[PDB]
Amino acid sequence: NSFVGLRVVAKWSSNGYFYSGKITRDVGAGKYKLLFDDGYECDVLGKDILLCDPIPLDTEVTALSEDEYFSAGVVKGHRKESGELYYSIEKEGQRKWYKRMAVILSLEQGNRLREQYGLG
Amino acid sequence: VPELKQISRVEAMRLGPGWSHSCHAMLYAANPGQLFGRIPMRFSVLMQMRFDGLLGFPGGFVDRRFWSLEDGLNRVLGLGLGCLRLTEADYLSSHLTEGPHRVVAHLYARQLTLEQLHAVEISAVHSRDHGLEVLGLVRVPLYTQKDRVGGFPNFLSNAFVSTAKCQLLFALKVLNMMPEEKLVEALAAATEKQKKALEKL
Amino acid sequence: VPELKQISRVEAMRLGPGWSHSCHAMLYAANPGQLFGRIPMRFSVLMQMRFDGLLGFPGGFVDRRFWSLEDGLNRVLGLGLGCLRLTEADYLSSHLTEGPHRVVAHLYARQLTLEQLHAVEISAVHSRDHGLEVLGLVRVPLYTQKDRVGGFPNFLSNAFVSTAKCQLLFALKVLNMMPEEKLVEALAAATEKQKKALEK
Numbered sequence A: 001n002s003f004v005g006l007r008v009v010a011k012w013s014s015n016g017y018f019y020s021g022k023i024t025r026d027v028g029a030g031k032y033k034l035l036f037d038d039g040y041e042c043d044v045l046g047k048d049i050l051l052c053d054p055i056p057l058d059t060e061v062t063a064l065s066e067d068e069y070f071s072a073g074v075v076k077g078h079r080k081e082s083g084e085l086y087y088s089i090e091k092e093g094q095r096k097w098y099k100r101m102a103v104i105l106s107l108e109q110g111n112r113l114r115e116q117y118g119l120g
Numbered sequence B: 001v002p003e004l005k006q007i008s009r010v011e012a013m014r015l016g017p018g019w020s021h022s023c024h025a026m027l028y029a030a031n032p033g034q035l036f037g038r039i040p041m042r043f044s045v046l047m048q049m050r051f052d053g054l055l056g057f058p059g060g061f062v063d064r065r066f067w068s069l070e071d072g073l074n075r076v077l078g079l080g081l082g083c084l085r086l087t088e089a090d091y092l093s094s095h096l097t098e099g100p101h102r103v104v105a106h107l108y109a110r111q112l113t114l115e116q117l118h119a120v121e122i123s124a125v126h127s128r129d130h131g132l133e134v135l136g137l138v139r140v141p142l143y144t145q146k147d148r149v150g151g152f153p154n155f156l157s158n159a160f161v162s163t164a165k166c167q168l169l170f171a172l173k174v175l176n177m178m179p180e181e182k183l184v185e186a187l188a189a190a191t192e193k194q195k196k197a198l199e200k201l
Numbered sequence C: 001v002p003e004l005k006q007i008s009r010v011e012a013m014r015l016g017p018g019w020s021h022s023c024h025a026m027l028y029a030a031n032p033g034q035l036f037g038r039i040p041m042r043f044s045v046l047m048q049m050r051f052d053g054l055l056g057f058p059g060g061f062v063d064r065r066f067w068s069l070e071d072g073l074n075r076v077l078g079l080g081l082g083c084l085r086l087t088e089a090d091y092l093s094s095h096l097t098e099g100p101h102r103v104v105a106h107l108y109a110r111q112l113t114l115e116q117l118h119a120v121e122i123s124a125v126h127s128r129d130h131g132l133e134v135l136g137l138v139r140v141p142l143y144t145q146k147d148r149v150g151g152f153p154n155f156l157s158n159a160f161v162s163t164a165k166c167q168l169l170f171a172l173k174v175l176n177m178m179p180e181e182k183l184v185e186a187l188a189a190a191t192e193k194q195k196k197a198l199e200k
Helices: A107-111 B069-080 B116-126 B152-156 B161-172 B178-199 C009-013 C069-081 C114-125 C152-156 C160-172 C180-199
Strands: A006-009 A020-030 A030-037 A040-047 A062-066 A069-081 A084-091 A092-099 B020-035 B039-050 B060-061 B089-097 B103-112 B134-141 C022-037 C037-051 C059-062 C089-098 C102-111 C134-141
Touching: A006 A030, A006 B020, A062 A084, A062 A092, A069 A092, A084 A107, A107 B152, B020 B069, B020 B116, B020 B161, B039 B116, B039 B161, B060 B069, B069 B103, B089 B161, B103 B116, B103 B161, B103 B178, B116 B134, B134 B152, B152 B178, B161 C180, B178 C160, B178 C180, C009 C089, C009 C102, C022 C114, C037 C114, C037 C160, C059 C069, C069 C114, C089 C160, C102 C114, C102 C160, C114 C134, C152 C180, C160 C180
Parallel strands: B020 B103, C022 C102
Antiparallel strands: A006 A020, A020 A030, A030 A040, A062 A069, A069 A084, A084 A092, B020 B039, B020 B060, B039 B134, B089 B103, B134 C134, C022 C037, C022 C059, C037 C134, C089 C102
16 A cells, blocks of 8 residues: 555645645655645645546646636546646637646635545 | 745755746835824835736746846846845745745845835836836835724735735734734734625625 | 715805815826737826825815815825925816715816826825825726736725725716726726635
């Protein structure tokens, strides 16, 4: 039973957004060292971690569109190219492709996944 | 009091290129003046009205590919205040801002003389960013009036950059400018004022 | 929409002694500049952060048993804006404020060049009341950004002198600076912001 090396979507604050990353160390006492794809590394409790990779189809997520503003969308497909995962997010009837780090969950969107993928 | 998650400087410098860095300065000075000749002001702090209609501190986003955090701050201060240079000795803290974007906010703070603080206000009206990104400087009133709203509570009820409002209250506490008991009191009165004003409309 | 009862100038001068009078000035200028090189700024209007932490217009109370409305207003303006005197021709409107206290608020307005407006901002920093009753001047952003809150709607979500917010919206309309639908939209977004922010 080891979570080290598994891809997750986690929040680094109790009321923040969920970002994609990986578990690096088992700090113990329900705590995990998590390295986010953005380079941020910190300890995170299991209740703040979603063990799901990729984000399931039809999930509502928050995506960075046009590299300026975030907005809500729905996952409609996945695709990997040269090791990089791309999400097909539909926003108001229009689909686009987003990098992995451009796809996050709001506190409400992620909390709705805790019972299916949560670590606590 | 709203609080952002702190991060050490060296660990912020390890954040990946997907993070944006912002540097802002809290300039303040002891003020022996008395409003109406009966209300001591104690300290004056400088904030500004931004292009987007929100209050915040001087500064902005910095490029740190090939420059330090201080060099980037001084660039955005030279455009926004036209004032003199700050150094690494003025660095106070770094915070991870509320999402969704990945931003780490560095806060600097220096106590000037009241004369030097006014000279910053004079230079700011002559700066390139005046009228464009910066729509004016405002002094923060740290006093409260007999009605218990006038002054600092009313000021906190304005619209802020969320990061700046957290930085203001965090700095006033750790710089020993306002007792933490007085900050929670003022912030509570401000919220109450916001409640009533919104209940009506 | 904030809309105070409007009374004529002569009807306001015949009110009993229990009424207080205030005089404030709205200085604005046509602005041909573009923010970020895209959105137009159109007009610049001057307001100020007051000692009490609220936004409002330059001016204050005038005691009619000592001053006329013009001489009283100009005494206050001289202490905060330097050398700028308005006249009876700059008078715009009179509005009866919300209770309990009975106050009549007289709005004055003068168009300037953007150069002259900036000169007023320079004089204000050197004025006598700078750092006492006036904590700084600010320009009103009349534009709205792509996110529909940036600019004028965010500005309208700040804390105002109740009369000043009505005088701003009234003056932008009758001075042909903002369309009616342009004001309603901004005020509705500002209110939605104050709700969205206080719930979170």
